[PDB]
Enzyme design. Structure first.
Site, PDB file in Angstrom:
ATOM      1  N   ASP A 109      22.668  20.352  -1.771  1.00  0.00           N
ATOM      2  CA  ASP A 109      22.996  21.921  -1.541  1.00  0.00           C
ATOM      3  C   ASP A 109      24.239  22.339  -1.532  1.00  0.00           C
ATOM      4  O   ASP A 109      24.922  22.884  -0.779  1.00  0.00           O
ATOM      5  CB  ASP A 109      22.263  22.420  -0.233  1.00  0.00           C
ATOM      6  CG  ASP A 109      21.980  24.001  -0.274  1.00  0.00           C
ATOM      7  OD1 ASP A 109      22.198  24.482  -1.423  1.00  0.00           O
ATOM      8  OD2 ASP A 109      21.444  24.632   0.488  1.00  0.00           O
TER       9      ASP A 109
ATOM     10  N   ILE B  80      28.054  31.596  15.077  1.00  0.00           N
ATOM     11  CA  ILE B  80      28.898  31.579  13.807  1.00  0.00           C
ATOM     12  C   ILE B  80      27.930  31.034  12.510  1.00  0.00           C
ATOM     13  O   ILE B  80      28.547  31.296  11.414  1.00  0.00           O
ATOM     14  CB  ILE B  80      30.159  30.381  13.898  1.00  0.00           C
ATOM     15  CG1 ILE B  80      29.454  29.142  13.869  1.00  0.00           C
ATOM     16  CG2 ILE B  80      31.043  30.955  14.940  1.00  0.00           C
ATOM     17  CD1 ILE B  80      30.560  28.053  13.866  1.00  0.00           C
ATOM     18  N   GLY B  81      26.769  31.266  12.592  1.00  0.00           N
ATOM     19  CA  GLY B  81      26.095  30.779  11.439  1.00  0.00           C
ATOM     20  C   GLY B  81      24.334  30.893  11.803  1.00  0.00           C
ATOM     21  O   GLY B  81      24.153  30.432  13.019  1.00  0.00           O
ATOM     22  N   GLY B  82      23.584  31.235  11.048  1.00  0.00           N
ATOM     23  CA  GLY B  82      22.286  31.748  11.180  1.00  0.00           C
ATOM     24  C   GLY B  82      21.279  31.402  10.058  1.00  0.00           C
ATOM     25  O   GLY B  82      20.293  31.798   9.836  1.00  0.00           O
TER      26      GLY B  82
ATOM     27  N   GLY C  90      18.746  27.947  11.072  1.00  0.00           N
ATOM     28  CA  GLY C  90      19.930  27.291  11.330  1.00  0.00           C
ATOM     29  C   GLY C  90      20.884  28.022  12.223  1.00  0.00           C
ATOM     30  O   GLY C  90      21.422  29.046  11.881  1.00  0.00           O
ATOM     31  N   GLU C  91      20.879  27.429  13.778  1.00  0.00           N
ATOM     32  CA  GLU C  91      21.371  28.149  14.533  1.00  0.00           C
ATOM     33  C   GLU C  91      22.797  27.299  14.859  1.00  0.00           C
ATOM     34  O   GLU C  91      22.750  26.164  15.204  1.00  0.00           O
ATOM     35  CB  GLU C  91      20.581  28.131  15.759  1.00  0.00           C
ATOM     36  CG  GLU C  91      20.965  28.972  16.886  1.00  0.00           C
ATOM     37  CD  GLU C  91      19.782  28.602  17.975  1.00  0.00           C
ATOM     38  OE1 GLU C  91      18.550  28.287  17.841  1.00  0.00           O
ATOM     39  OE2 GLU C  91      20.241  29.055  19.080  1.00  0.00           O
ATOM     40  N   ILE C  92      23.919  27.923  14.437  1.00  0.00           N
ATOM     41  CA  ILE C  92      25.072  27.093  15.046  1.00  0.00           C
ATOM     42  C   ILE C  92      26.140  28.003  15.573  1.00  0.00           C
ATOM     43  O   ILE C  92      26.169  29.259  15.483  1.00  0.00           O
ATOM     44  CB  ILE C  92      25.913  26.788  13.593  1.00  0.00           C
ATOM     45  CG1 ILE C  92      27.193  26.099  13.880  1.00  0.00           C
ATOM     46  CG2 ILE C  92      25.909  27.719  12.366  1.00  0.00           C
ATOM     47  CD1 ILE C  92      27.618  25.354  12.598  1.00  0.00           C
TER      48      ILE C  92
ATOM     49  N   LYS D 183      25.426  22.698  16.446  1.00  0.00           N
ATOM     50  CA  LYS D 183      24.178  23.275  15.441  1.00  0.00           C
ATOM     51  C   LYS D 183      23.191  22.671  16.340  1.00  0.00           C
ATOM     52  O   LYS D 183      23.086  21.495  16.922  1.00  0.00           O
ATOM     53  CB  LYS D 183      24.524  22.417  14.286  1.00  0.00           C
ATOM     54  CG  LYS D 183      23.393  22.811  13.026  1.00  0.00           C
ATOM     55  CD  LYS D 183      24.072  22.249  11.763  1.00  0.00           C
ATOM     56  CE  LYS D 183      23.024  22.478  10.783  1.00  0.00           C
ATOM     57  NZ  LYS D 183      23.579  22.311   9.430  1.00  0.00           N
TER      58      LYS D 183
END
Ligand SMILES: Nc1ncnc2c1ncn2[C@@H]1O[C@H](COP(=O)(O)OP(=O)(O)O)[C@@H](O)[C@H]1O
Ligand SMILES: [Mg+2]
Ligand code: NA
Ligand code: NA
Ligand code: NA
Ligand code: NA
EC number: 2.7.11.1
Length: 287
Positions: free
Chosen positions: A130, A19-21, A22-24, A39
């Site tokens: 951030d 669901i996110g790419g 940081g690997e989640i 994560k």
């Protein structure tokens, strides 16, 4: 990547979908039979930040706008953290709108929730550093989908001491965050403070209502900083309710060593919401 769909972490979390790419990942928690967010980072990645992420997530536990902490671990291949899975992030929600903008009603309500989350992370001694729309997401269930959650503490820094006082700033600090939403301080490689998270919030709110920021097309980080340093930020007030002049005047007056007047900034949202007749139950734009 370090993991792959299907693998089991700690004999408990089955990785189901990236669901996110940081690997989640969205992972199945076999203990609770619920989908969770997992994560992971390589134990060989030079910039290892999940230690920070877990520490801040643990420090925020119980507070509003924060994912529930579920678990964490560290092995010779990777570090991981498991937390409550949320819904769509605000960058995706704004891009899913045909005009690329939110109404002032959705903007004010989101902004007020984001301000609450920023005051909360500062109150536990950390800067986010951030603040940007992809680091906020709405809940995924009827009881949470009107709540905005703050994500991604990997770039956070503690600005207090072990005693709780404000730590002396470094002479030079590496720029860590996102060029589009970065404050002038960040561009100058100066130590970021609480007001710099608030500058990023201000840029986010302007981009929500206008749909872009003045430096959208500029990719050189130094060029962006030069524009920000000379920019008359009063021009951004044109599309915000009148009391945001108070918001901008206040954050402009701040520096590393000045605690923000969070009550004043909250009043800007509360007063604007009341003047516009906005109520919490009004549909958000994506409804
Ligand atoms: N708890 C979560 N629930 C749902 N989506 C999440 C969650 N945490 C992160 N995400 C998604 O993953 C994206 C990236 O995760 P994030 O924690 O911001 O890490 P990074 O920015 O380092 O890749 C977010 O923009 C969001 O869409
Ligand atoms: Mg992120
Ligand atoms: Na930690
Ligand atoms: Na730690
Ligand atoms: Na830094
Ligand atoms: Na000062």
């Amino acid at each position: 990547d370090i993991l792959s769909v299907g693998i089991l972490v700690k004999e408990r979390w089955k990785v189901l979908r990236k669901i996110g790419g940081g690997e989640i990942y969205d992972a199945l928690d076999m203990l609770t039979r619920e989908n969770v967010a997992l994560k992971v980072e390589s134990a060989q990645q030079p910039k290892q930040v999940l230690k920070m992420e877990v520490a801040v997530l643990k420090k925020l536990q119980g507070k509003d706008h924060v994912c529930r902490f579920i678990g964490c671990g560290r092995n010779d291949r990777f570090n991981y953290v498991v937390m409550q899975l949320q819904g769509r992030n605000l960058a995706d929600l704004r891009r899913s709108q045909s005009r690329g903008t939110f109404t002032i009603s959705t903007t004010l309500r989101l902004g007020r929730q984001i301000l609450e989350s920023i005051e909360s992370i500062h109150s536990v001694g950390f800067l986010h550093r951030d603040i940007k729309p992809s680091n906020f997401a709405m809940g995924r269930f009827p009881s949470t989908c009107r709540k905005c959650y703050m994500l991604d503490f990997g770039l956070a820094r503690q600005f207090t001491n072990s005693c709780g006082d404000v730590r002396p700033p470094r002479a030079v600090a590496g720029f860590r965050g996102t060029v589009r939403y970065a404050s002038i301080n960040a561009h100058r490689n100066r130590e970021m403070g609480r007001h710099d998270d608030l500058w990023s919030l201000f840029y986010m709110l302007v981009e929500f209502v206008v749909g872009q920021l003045p430096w959208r097309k500029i990719k050189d980080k130094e060029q962006v900083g030069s524009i920000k340093e000379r920019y008359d930020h009063r021009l951004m007030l044109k599309h915000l309710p009148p009391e945001f002049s108070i918001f901008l005047d206040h954050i402009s007056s701040l520096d590393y060593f000045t605690k923000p007047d969070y009550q004043l900034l909250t009043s800007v949202f509360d007063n604007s919401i009341k003047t516009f007749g906005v109520i919490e139950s009004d549909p958000f734009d994506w409804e």
